[PDB]
Amino acid sequence: VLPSARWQYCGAPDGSQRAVLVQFSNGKLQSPGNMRFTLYENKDSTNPRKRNQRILAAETDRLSYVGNNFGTGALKCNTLCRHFVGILNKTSGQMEVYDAELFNMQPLFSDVSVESELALESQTKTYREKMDSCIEAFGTTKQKRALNTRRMNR
C-alpha cells in the first residue's frame, strides 16, 4: 500500500475534549440550518458512574432534538466499540487521533396526561369487555372474530 499516515494520539483524556458525532432518527441532514447544538453534562464529576453521562440538544427553527449518552436511547456501539476522529494533514502525514462520542438524536415533543383520569369506560361489564380482546387487535382467530360479532346475530 502506497498511502499511509503517522499516528499521533493527541488530546488529553477528558469528557468534552472528546469530539462528538451526531446521528438523527428521522433522516440525514443534507443542510445544517441554524441548528443550535448544545451539550450538557452532569454536575457531579467525582463518582465514576454519574460522570461521563451527557445529553446533546439541537434546536431547529421548527422542531427540537435530544440525544443521551446513557440509559434507554444510547447506542451499543459506544460500549462494544470505541470511536475516534482522525484529523489527517496531507502534507505532514500526521493522523491526530481524538476520542469520539456518537449520539442518536430523537425529536422532542410535549407529554400527554389526559387519559390518566379518563380510565372508566363502561367498567360495569367484565366479560362483555372481553370483546376488546376479540377484535382486530389481539384477535383470537378468524372464527372468534367473525363469530363473536353480535353473537352470530342470534
Partner: protein, 55 residues
C-alpha cells in the same frame, strides 16, 4: 433546517405520512409539518420479473 429520508415518512420527526388525499399538502399528524404533494412525482419504482432467460 430540513432532512433527507424516505418520502413516505416525515423528514422532521420520522413519523409515517398518511396517504395523499384530495388536497395538495400532506400534513404530518405528530409534528404538524406540510409535505408538498408534488414531491411524490419523483418516484419511479421500475421493477422487473423474468420468466424465462433468453439463452
Amino acid at each position: 433546517s430540513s432532512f433527507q429520508s424516505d418520502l413516505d415518512f416525515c423528514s422532521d420527526c420520522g413519523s409515517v405520512l398518511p396517504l395523499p388525499g384530495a388536497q395538495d399538502t400532506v400534513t404530518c399528524i405528530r409534528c404538524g409539518f406540510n409535505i408538498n404533494v408534488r414531491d411524490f412525482e419523483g418516484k419511479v419504482v421500475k421493477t422487473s420479473v423474468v420468466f424465462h432467460q433468453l439463452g
